[PDB]
């Protein structure tokens, strides 16, 4: 079957160069054009341009003309997207796609899995983890919320579990926000019986692979400050 497989996620600093790849298999590579598409965080699809691997002809969207280079090595059925100098604004998911001409138009009938490119001046940093717990006397309903604030890390992602994975029901782990500092922050919360607050312990477990760190935080509210 037709497959496009892209190179792995990249985390780069502004000004660095980058070349990402798209390997086609299960079909005759030189027979089909390969297009590239950008998707910025939380945004839609944008056409970047294409290459005809049979003659190396390339064509770019006006916005991308001069900003990036598309190439192909047909001997290894591989297409490439390249930047000589990255900008933070280049942060996005990049897809390659095979073009199949049908109904008298080009269609993108097979897509790569995407390559996530993150460009930032930030440096790798593990999170600090802080408890989210109600004020001592503010729990009046029969269920309470507790959580952990996972702050000031880079790059994404972190993974958060509760009670070593024993607690999954009612957990909401929110999308991270990018702070003005260039570091991410997210919260993870769980709703639990108010009864259990003095009987049961709740601990969040926060893994951050890029920094090789893991932080556990027992959620508590101390009775003096």
């Amino acid at each position: 079957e037709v497959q496009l497989v892209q190179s792995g996620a990249e985390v780069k600093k502004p000004g660095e160069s980058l070349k990402i790849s798209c390997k086609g298999s299960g079909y005759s590579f030189t027979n089909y054009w390969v297009g590239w598409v950008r998707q910025m965080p939380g945004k839609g699809l944008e056409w970047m341009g294409f290459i005809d691997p049979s003659d190396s002809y390339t064509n770019y969207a006006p916005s991308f003309q001069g900003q990036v280079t598309i190439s192909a090595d047909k001997s290894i059925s591989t297409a490439y997207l390249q930047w000589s100098s990255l900008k933070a604004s280049d942060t996005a998911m990049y897809y390659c796609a095979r073009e199949l001409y049908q109904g008298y138009m080009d269609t993108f009938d097979s897509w790569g899995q995407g390559t996530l490119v993150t460009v930032s001046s930030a440096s790798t940093k593990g999170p600090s983890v802080f408890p989210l717990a109600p004020c001592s006397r503010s729990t009046s309903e029969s269920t309470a919320a507790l959580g952990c604030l996972v702050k000031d890390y880079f790059p994404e992602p972190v993974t958060v579990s509760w009670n070593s994975g024993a607690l999954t029901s009612g957990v909401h782990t929110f999308p991270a926000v990018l702070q003005s500092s260039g570091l991410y922050s997210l919260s993870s919360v769980v709703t639990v019986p108010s009864s259990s607050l003095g009987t049961k312990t709740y601990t969040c477990n926060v893994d951050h692979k890029p920094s090789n760190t893991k932080v556990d935080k027992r959620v508590h509210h101390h009775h003096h400050h």
């Binding site: 796609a97 138009m105 993108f108 802080f130 989210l132 004020c135 309903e141 929110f174 919260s187």
Partner: protein, 214 residues
Amino acid sequence: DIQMTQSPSSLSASVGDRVTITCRASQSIGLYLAWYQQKPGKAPKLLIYAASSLQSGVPSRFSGSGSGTDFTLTISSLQPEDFATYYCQQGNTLSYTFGQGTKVEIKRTVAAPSVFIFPPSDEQLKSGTASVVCLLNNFYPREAKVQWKVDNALQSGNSQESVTEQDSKDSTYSLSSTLTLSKADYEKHKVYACEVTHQGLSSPVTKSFNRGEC
């Protein structure tokens, strides 16, 4: 420079509904419009090409119509696997362009959020910063207004929020908003409050705490 405009930008629908999404081109593209589906984190997939031709393997509940400048994608009898974002794309020229996308979300009954406020931890304060968090749990629809007040003054510019995708069990949203102050500014004030407005609430709900009595 053919601009594609989709409408609506989002809609809520129930399994079994007939859903219609429209796409307008800034100039005629004849029949040369395709439709794509994308789910979060996943690659798009081709559904329809040349306005009305169904892509091999795609369920026949997807249909397309239109020509010139006005096009429609219709999903008859919406299925659970159809909640996703849909993009149109013109291929009249070699300079392809996509519409901005239409997100098809799950309709359910109104549900008011449960609201919680969390003071900053002592360990965070030690480091010089105070994050105050307001949680809105399990609400529907997505539209919600969260306002922070400190000593009864409305805050602006110093909070960020994010929202989960619809819950797999109850199709609700949850939202977290974080107000961030320096420790020195945090210790200047007494009253910390988040006020929540939502269709499910007859009047806004405020949750609050007083520094020194929390």
